[PDB]
Amino acid sequence: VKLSHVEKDFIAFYSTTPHHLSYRDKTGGSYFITRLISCFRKHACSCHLFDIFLKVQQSFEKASIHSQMPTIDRATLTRYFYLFPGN
Amino acid sequence: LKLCSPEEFTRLCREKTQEIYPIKEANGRTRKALIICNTEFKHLSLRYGANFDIIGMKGLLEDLGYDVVVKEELTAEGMESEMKDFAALSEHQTSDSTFLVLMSHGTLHGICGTMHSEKTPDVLQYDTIYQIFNNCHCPGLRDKPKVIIVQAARGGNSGEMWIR
Known part of the structure; x- marks a missing residue:
């Protein structure tokens, strides 16, 4: 028998802020997904999950005519989540 | 996908053990990830490019070590059942x-x-x-990171505006 939190170790990353639209590439790919993959492939080797998410958000920082801002939500991680790709 | 070296993997897991999520060695490891995607809808517009997103996320998660489960064209109850x-x-x-x-x-x-x-x-x-x-409700993932990626709009309003 042991005690446990009901809800813990969650993190959510939404493609947009509440009440707002999400956009796709001329080719049809989601900007959110495309940049998420790009930042993971480049930075998973040396950065934990939150820093990767932050880099994704930074890539949307400059406003354009179809802006969106990915949003970290309901985050209850208590440690850094390193993926250690290749191990 | 750029890889982390075994030396740095071991260094971090030793130096900051209490502040990183512990990683299981790949030999008996059975990472699972889930992709739920709805492309065609009875009343809503077709989501062109969704399959490009599936393929891109599926390949990234596999490169990260996850066996990927993909479920498509589900109602809300179907999504709940599959989850x-x-x-x-x-x-x-x-x-x-x-x-x-x-x-x-x-x-x-x-x-x-x-x-x-x-x-x-x-x-x-x-x-x-x-x-x-x-x-x-999920004992197998107790104390382990559960990362939710949400590819969806959260409303109908534009997310930019003009300022001076």
């Missing part, structure tokens, strides 16, 4: 984490099933996802 099935996989116990990727039409409070419309609501509350996977 409960996925949350109960015994392979989570021999895993260290999971990713849950959800791609569909979205509202402020949830993700749309294939049958959604204003007159025929078909939505899975984002709050329900946490209930399905929390420490009460």
